[PDB]
Ligand binder design. Structure first.
Ligand SMILES: CC/C=C\C/C=C\C/C=C\C/C=C\C/C=C\CCCC(=O)OC[C@H](CO[C@@H]1O[C@H](CO[C@H]2O[C@H](CO)[C@H](O)[C@H](O)[C@H]2O)[C@H](O)[C@H](O)[C@H]1O)OC(=O)C/C=C\C/C=C\C/C=C\C/C=C\C/C=C\CC
Ligand SMILES: CC/C=C\C/C=C\C/C=C\C/C=C\C/C=C\CCCC(=O)OC[C@H](CO[C@@H]1O[C@H](CO[C@H]2O[C@H](CO)[C@H](O)[C@H](O)[C@H]2O)[C@H](O)[C@H](O)[C@H]1O)OC(=O)C/C=C\C/C=C\C/C=C\C/C=C\C/C=C\CC
Ligand code: CLA
Ligand code: CLA
Ligand SMILES: CC(=O)O[C@H]1CC(C)(C)C(=C=C/C(C)=C/C=C/C=C/C=C(C)/C=C2C=C(/C=C/[C@@]34O[C@]3(C)C[C@@H](O)CC4(C)C)C(=O)O/2)[C@](C)(O)C1
Ligand SMILES: CC(=O)O[C@H]1CC(C)(C)C(=C=C/C(C)=C/C=C/C=C/C=C(C)/C=C2C=C(/C=C/[C@@]34O[C@]3(C)C[C@@H](O)CC4(C)C)C(=O)O/2)[C@](C)(O)C1
Ligand SMILES: CC(=O)O[C@H]1CC(C)(C)C(=C=C/C(C)=C/C=C/C=C/C=C(C)/C=C2C=C(/C=C/[C@@]34O[C@]3(C)C[C@@H](O)CC4(C)C)C(=O)O/2)[C@](C)(O)C1
Ligand SMILES: CC(=O)O[C@H]1CC(C)(C)C(=C=C/C(C)=C/C=C/C=C/C=C(C)/C=C2C=C(/C=C/[C@@]34O[C@]3(C)C[C@@H](O)CC4(C)C)C(=O)O/2)[C@](C)(O)C1
Ligand SMILES: CC(=O)O[C@H]1CC(C)(C)C(=C=C/C(C)=C/C=C/C=C/C=C(C)/C=C2C=C(/C=C/[C@@]34O[C@]3(C)C[C@@H](O)CC4(C)C)C(=O)O/2)[C@](C)(O)C1
Ligand SMILES: CC(=O)O[C@H]1CC(C)(C)C(=C=C/C(C)=C/C=C/C=C/C=C(C)/C=C2C=C(/C=C/[C@@]34O[C@]3(C)C[C@@H](O)CC4(C)C)C(=O)O/2)[C@](C)(O)C1
Ligand SMILES: CC(=O)O[C@H]1CC(C)(C)C(=C=C/C(C)=C/C=C/C=C/C=C(C)/C=C2C=C(/C=C/[C@@]34O[C@]3(C)C[C@@H](O)CC4(C)C)C(=O)O/2)[C@](C)(O)C1
Ligand SMILES: CC(=O)O[C@H]1CC(C)(C)C(=C=C/C(C)=C/C=C/C=C/C=C(C)/C=C2C=C(/C=C/[C@@]34O[C@]3(C)C[C@@H](O)CC4(C)C)C(=O)O/2)[C@](C)(O)C1
Ligand SMILES: [Cl-]
Ligand SMILES: [Cl-]
Ligand SMILES: [Cl-]
Ligand SMILES: [Cl-]
Ligand SMILES: [K+]
Ligand SMILES: [K+]
Lengths: 151, 151
């Protein structure tokens, strides 16, 4: 047990209602988040690849395992994993994030932002309950504070 | 040095002409290989996630590093990495493939085949020199024989 795991349970309390509202089977998630821009997108993928190579390989393995288990508990009309598996994925990802330097994480974020059209967040939010999305994000903010402490 | 590395150099002799002909900046590679089928695609991703969790985490790290370096040597009008980085990526991937049971690898292959429209290979081949694609594939066949010996 660790503090990221405890923070993941609070994150689940804040964010699972939102996860149940997302239609995970919508094909839109395969499309670029705006205009397809291969050269800029490759720069973002490169920052991810750098981060993945730097991450604790054991924590990467555990995060992959948590997603395998999560796939197994998918149910209902939107393809949402169970509450327990949601929390397990989020904890495992938090551990991976904490295992690399903050710069690496910020470089992925900035590089993905560069290819994301300004309308995409509002469009995604419009498909779910906006107050639940807001609660989920406020949950994320608290969670990342715990992740940073462990980083 | 190892036998996968030696086999990767022979693979490069057979396949680099083909890699130079592919337009790596074509946006088509973001689309599903046929009809977008989220439920079946998730099954294929699940088999990949199982395989990634089983792979030697050190060899996964080295494969990610080889791709970072490869991105750095991209040049020319098609976005092709250097010959040396092509071989380095292929060796590193061969090591990852050899680090898991053959079943896991075949399960990814079969699961991806299930979502790949029968026209996709011929369409991809039609964009390059068909004899160079054939040489590349004959190269792959020899390479995977070395990978299997190490597996
Ligand atoms: C063949 C290739 C195969 C596959 C292709 C590969 C990849 C697909 C590539 C791209 C598709 C992926 C993602 C893009 C898709 C979807 C995008 C998903 C992300 C999103 O929607 O983000 C919304 C967010 C909104 O802005 C925030 O608003 C805040 C408001 O806060 C106030 O009010 C609150 C309540 O309202 C609270 O009360 C608070 O207390 C109060 O403070 C503050 O103003 C913040 O400063 C401000 O940041 O926007 C941004 O962060 C920047 C945009 C994009 C970054 C993009 C993404 C995140 C970055 C990195 C994630 C890492 C990786 C993503 C990718 C993959 C995951 C591994
Ligand atoms: C939001 C989500 C984000 C991203 C989405 C994520 C993923 C994208 C998902 C999918 C897109 C990916 C791929 C699909 C895209 C493109 C497809 C790329 C693959 C392709 O084109 O394959 C062509 C191949 C042709 O068939 C072979 O013909 C042979 C002929 O051999 C003779 O003649 C020869 C010379 O002519 C020689 O002389 C020889 O000596 C002589 O023997 C034999 O008959 C073989 O028995 C027969 O197998 O087809 C198949 O293998 C099955 C089809 C698809 C499997 C699909 C893929 C491979 C499987 C696994 C690869 C693993 C993973 C792929 C994916 C990713 C890689 C990590
Ligand atoms: C089928 C399998 C699968 C699927 C469908 C996904 C889907 C996703 N992954 Mg995951 N992932 C997988 C397997 C999968 N992954 C595997 C095998 C691994 C390796 C172990 C990872 C490792 C991984 C990492 C390291 C990250 C992702 C992230 C993401 C998201 C990227 C787009 C995004 O930011 O949306 C928005 C995100 C969500 C809807 C997820 C919930 C986010 C918080 C907790 C609550 C919602 C807040 C707010 C409303 C929206 C996000 C704002 C943002 C600024 C934080 C998306 C939800 C990224 C992510 O979520 O970035 C924010 C991310 O950082 N994945
Ligand atoms: C921007 C980065 C990037 C890009 C663009 C790609 C692109 C690709 N990856 Mg790679 N990968 C990356 C980073 C990247 N990867 C990273 C960071 C990792 C983790 C370390 C991986 C790990 C990985 C694995 C484990 C595998 C791939 C494979 C593939 C291919 C999947 C589609 C396919 O089969 O086409 C066809 C494939 C090619 C054109 C590549 C050359 C294949 C041989 C050597 C020669 C050509 C033979 C023939 C003409 C066509 C293929 C037939 C097939 C049955 C073998 C595609 C070329 C897969 C692959 O190639 O499956 C066959 C695969 O198994 N990737
Ligand atoms: C081979 C392999 O290993 O694959 C595995 C690799 C990983 C990394 C482990 C993995 C993973 C995670 C991944 C990739 C997550 C990707 C998330 C992508 C989210 C994409 C979104 C939100 C895309 C869009 C596009 C939109 C477009 C919206 C608009 O155009 C619309 C409609 C109308 C316009 O007028 C205005 C507009 C508003 C602009 C939008 O609003 O949102 C996975 C899944 O496991 C696969
Ligand atoms: C060996 C191997 O194969 O590894 C493979 C392993 C994987 C995992 C499969 C893999 C991969 C994918 C990877 C690495 C993904 C990385 C994801 C990173 C996500 C980062 C995020 C969300 C960062 C942020 C930063 C934010 C900042 C927000 C703020 O600053 C803002 C705006 C304003 C401030 O006032 C408040 C604030 C809140 C502070 C935010 O909101 O979010 C890959 C590439 O395939 C390689
Ligand atoms: C088709 C289908 O059915 O697909 C199904 C597939 C599944 C897998 C079964 C499934 C599922 C679950 C999924 C996708 C869950 C996704 C979870 C994503 C979690 C992401 C996390 C936590 C990312 C971060 C990034 C962080 C960054 C933190 C920092 O940068 C910040 C901000 C500020 C810096 O100063 C300090 C910092 C600390 C560096 C962080 O702390 O965390 C589902 C829903 O069922 C759908
Ligand atoms: C080849 C093939 O077929 O592969 C298949 C493989 C798969 C895995 C099966 C597959 C899949 C599924 C995938 C990747 C799913 C990814 C899902 C990502 C969902 C992202 C969502 C919901 C994003 C958001 C962002 C929002 C932002 C909200 C806010 O920021 C806003 C506006 C304003 C702020 O003030 C407050 C805020 C509230 C913070 C929100 O509310 O939501 C797919 C697509 O089928 C393809
Ligand atoms: C977030 C993160 O970590 O992301 C990283 C995760 C990884 C795994 C490390 C990673 C990787 C590798 C990946 C995903 C490779 C994906 C390869 C995909 C190849 C897709 C292809 C060939 C798609 C098509 C679609 C086609 C459609 C053709 C047709 O429709 C057409 C035109 C006309 C129709 O009439 C007939 C038709 C013929 C049917 C086609 O012919 O081919 C990467 C890139 O690093 C990102
Ligand atoms: C911890 C963590 O995060 O790990 C992350 C790590 C990654 C790597 C980023 C990641 C990923 C992606 C993964 C695993 C991809 C796996 C790719 C597997 C590719 C398999 C291939 C091509 C298999 C085959 C089999 C073939 C067979 C051909 C033949 O049988 C045929 C027809 C006919 C016979 O007569 C001749 C023959 C020739 C014998 C073939 O031709 O090809 C993921 C999911 O993101 C998780
Ligand atoms: C936009 C842009 O510019 O992107 C740029 C991004 C880069 C990275 C810089 C770049 C590059 C390079 C790239 C993509 C290289 C891709 C290489 C893929 C290699 C895949 C390999 C080897 C896969 C396998 C699968 C195998 C399976 C073997 C077996 O199953 C087989 C058959 C039969 C079983 O009985 C035994 C077995 C042994 C189990 C194997 O042995 O090997 C480029 C080109 O510049 C484009
Ligand atoms: C959000 C966002 O923007 O992300 C961006 C991220 C990136 C990384 C920048 C990105 C990218 C690039 C990517 C994934 C590139 C992947 C490329 C895959 C290429 C696959 C090719 C060539 C496949 C083939 C198959 C062929 C088959 C030939 C044969 O089988 C045939 C018919 C018949 C047999 O008898 C003989 C044979 C000869 C064996 C062939 O000849 O070729 C992208 C797309 O821009 C999206
Ligand atoms: Cl929807
Ligand atoms: Cl571009
Ligand atoms: Cl082309
Ligand atoms: Cl389906
Ligand atoms: K561009
Ligand atoms: K289906």
């Amino acid at each position: 047990a660790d503090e990221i795991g405890d923070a993941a349970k609070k994150l689940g309390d804040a964010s699972y209602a939102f996860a149940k509202e997302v239609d995970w089977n919508n094909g839109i998630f395969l499309q670029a988040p705006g205009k397809l821009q291969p050269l800029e997108a490759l720069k973002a993928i490169d920052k991810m690849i750098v981060m993945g190579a730097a991450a604790d390989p054991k924590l990467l393995k555990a995060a992959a395992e948590a997603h395998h288990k999560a796939i197994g508990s998918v149910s209902g009309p939107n393809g949402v994993t169970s509450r327990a598996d949601w929390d397990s994925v989020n904890a495992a990802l938090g551990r991976v994030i904490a295992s690399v330097p903050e710069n690496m994480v910020m470089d992925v974020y900035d590089s993905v932002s560069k290819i994301t059209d300004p309308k995409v967040p509002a469009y995604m939010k419009s498909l779910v309950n906006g107050a639940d999305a807001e609660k989920a994000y406020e949950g994320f903010l608290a969670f990342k504070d715990v992740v940073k402490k462990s980083q």
